[PDB]
Write an enzyme that holds these catalytic residues in place. Structure first.
Site, PDB file in Angstrom:
ATOM      1  N   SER A 181      21.306  25.601  46.857  1.00 14.97           N
ATOM      2  CA  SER A 181      21.562  24.519  45.020  1.00 14.97           C
ATOM      3  C   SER A 181      21.948  25.729  44.096  1.00 14.97           C
ATOM      4  CB  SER A 181      20.310  23.455  45.094  1.00 14.97           C
ATOM      5  OG  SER A 181      20.633  22.881  43.994  1.00 14.97           O
ATOM      6  N   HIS A 317      18.581  17.721  51.087  1.00 16.96           N
ATOM      7  CA  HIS A 317      19.187  19.289  50.116  1.00 16.96           C
ATOM      8  C   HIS A 317      18.368  20.459  50.953  1.00 16.96           C
ATOM      9  CE1 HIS A 317      22.226  20.962  48.138  1.00 16.96           C
ATOM     10  NE2 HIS A 317      21.536  20.774  46.665  1.00 16.96           N
TER      11      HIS A 317
END
Ligand SMILES: *[C@@H]1O[C@H](CO)[C@@H](O[C@@H]2O[C@H](CO)[C@@H](O[C@@H]3O[C@H](CO)[C@@H](O)[C@H](O[C@H]4O[C@H](CO)[C@@H](O)[C@H](O)[C@@H]4O)[C@@H]3O)[C@H](O)[C@H]2NC(C)=O)[C@H](O)[C@H]1NC(C)=O
Length: 370
Positions: A181, A317
């Site tokens: 991320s 994620h």
């Protein structure tokens, strides 16, 4: 060795990815020995328009093992700063060991043959704090570097300190970098600006990292919410305060993030981009088309297979799927474990349209000198 940029650049609005082989001088690259000076141009462009100044090695760098902590002290005039990184040595093979610097933490499986250096990158320069971190204590809060390029400077110092301290038991020539991320972004930029990094593994870094600003702008324009230049300068201090002048005029930027990937083609070093087709805000079709453009520089310089791309669909994620392991294993093998395994990996499982010519109106030149 190379000149600095003109005081001002005039770049006519271009809806496609600028030719990475077209110097601002005007001449298009035809010789390998020209690439170094284009590479600096690109580095200087990124720092002026988006990142802030990536400072040189300061006058002093000193290091000291203290248990598992590698404590790195630097100074420049009367100013001095210290930052510590944890090294967890592996449990297989012999010193000096290959390592991976993790921005905050890894979300990749790091083998038991490779050391885990845990870098406090938000401690160096903060996630959402303008001029906050060790970097800014040292250089000044008013220093124009963003928290992404200031973290990358810390990775240059981490490697300086591994060259000075064999005590740490780490081969300086075989230090990787990874993050997920926000740290996909950081790790991508660290690997682009620190030439000594052996292998970068950015994971789900999306726009700014794997993706191009122009394609993010067109994803937005087509109705889907994505991390555009306009968006990204808001929740963070990742980029220089200067970046937010340009976010609204992307077509007039004499660069895009495909040229960030191009920094990895000389001196040639491993770059595997691990991405997620499932999460809209990453811009899956941007990541793929942007990367594919970046690899054209690798292709010209005959180091195509040093740049890998893997896009997989998964709801979670930062959860590494087992599907992507063979590709990660291969890149760790070649560039860290000094093995002799092939690394031609370029795949997406994404169901979007794959049209290069949409973004790339320039040809891969034959470079003579290689
Ligand atoms: C933003 O949305 C716009 C929508 O206009 C979009 O630009 C367009 O992309 C489509 C998709 O590629 C383009 O349409 C293509 O045009 C050619 C002929 O001109 C067709 O042959 C293409 O189709 C084929 O692909 C199909 C499925 O893969 C096959 O089954 C079929 O047999 C064909 O082989 C396709 O229709 C169109 O030209 C552009 N338009 C413009 C204005 O450029 C853009 O792609 C979207 N951008 C993003 C970021 O998503």
């Amino acid at each position: 060795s190379c000149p600095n940029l003109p005081a001002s650049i005039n770049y006519a609005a271009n809806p496609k990815l600028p030719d990475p082989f077209l110097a601002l001088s005007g001449t298009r690259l035809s010789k390998k020995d020209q690439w170094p000076c284009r590479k600096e141009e690109i580095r200087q462009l990124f720092q002026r328009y988006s990142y802030g100044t990536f400072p040189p090695r300061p006058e002093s760098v000193t290091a000291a093992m203290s248990g598992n902590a590698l404590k790195i002290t630097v100074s420049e005039g009367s100013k001095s700063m210290s930052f510590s990184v944890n090294i967890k040595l592996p449990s297989s093979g012999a010193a000096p060991y290959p390592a991976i610097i993790a921005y905050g933490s890894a979300s990749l499986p790091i083998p038991n043959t490779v050391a885990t250096i845990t870098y406090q990158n938000f401690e160096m320069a903060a996630d959402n704090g303008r001029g906050k971190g060790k970097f800014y204590e040292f250089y000044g809060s008013n220093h124009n570097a963003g928290g992404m390029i200031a973290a990358a400077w810390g990775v240059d110092r981490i490697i300086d300190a591994l060259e000075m301290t064999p005590a740490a038991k780490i081969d300086p020539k075989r230090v990787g970098v990874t993050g997920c991320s926000r740290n996909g972004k950081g790790s991508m930029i660290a690997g682009a600006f620190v030439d000594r990094i052996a292998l970068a593994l950015p994971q789900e870094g999306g726009q700014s990292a794997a993706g191009c600003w122009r394609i993010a702008d067109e994803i937005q324009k087509n109705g889907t919410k994505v991390e555009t230049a306009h968006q990204i300068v808001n929740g963070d201090s990742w980029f220089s305060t200067d970046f937010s002048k340009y976010v609204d005029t992307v077509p007039t930027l004499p660069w895009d993030n495909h040229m960030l990937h191009a920094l990895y083609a000389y001196p040639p070093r491993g770059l595997l981009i691990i991405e997620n087709t499932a999460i809209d805000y990453l811009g899956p079709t941007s990541n793929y088309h942007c990367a594919t453009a970046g690899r054209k520089v690798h292709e010209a310089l005959g180091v195509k297979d040093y740049f890998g791309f893997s896009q997989n669909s998964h709801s979670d994620h930062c959860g590494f799927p087992k599907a992507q392991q063979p590709e990660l294993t291969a890149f760790i093998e070649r560039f860290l474990l000094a093995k002799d395994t092939k690394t031609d990996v370029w795949k997406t499982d994404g169901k979007f349209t794959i049209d290069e010519r949409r973004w790339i109106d320039w040809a891969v030149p034959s470079l003579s000198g290689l």
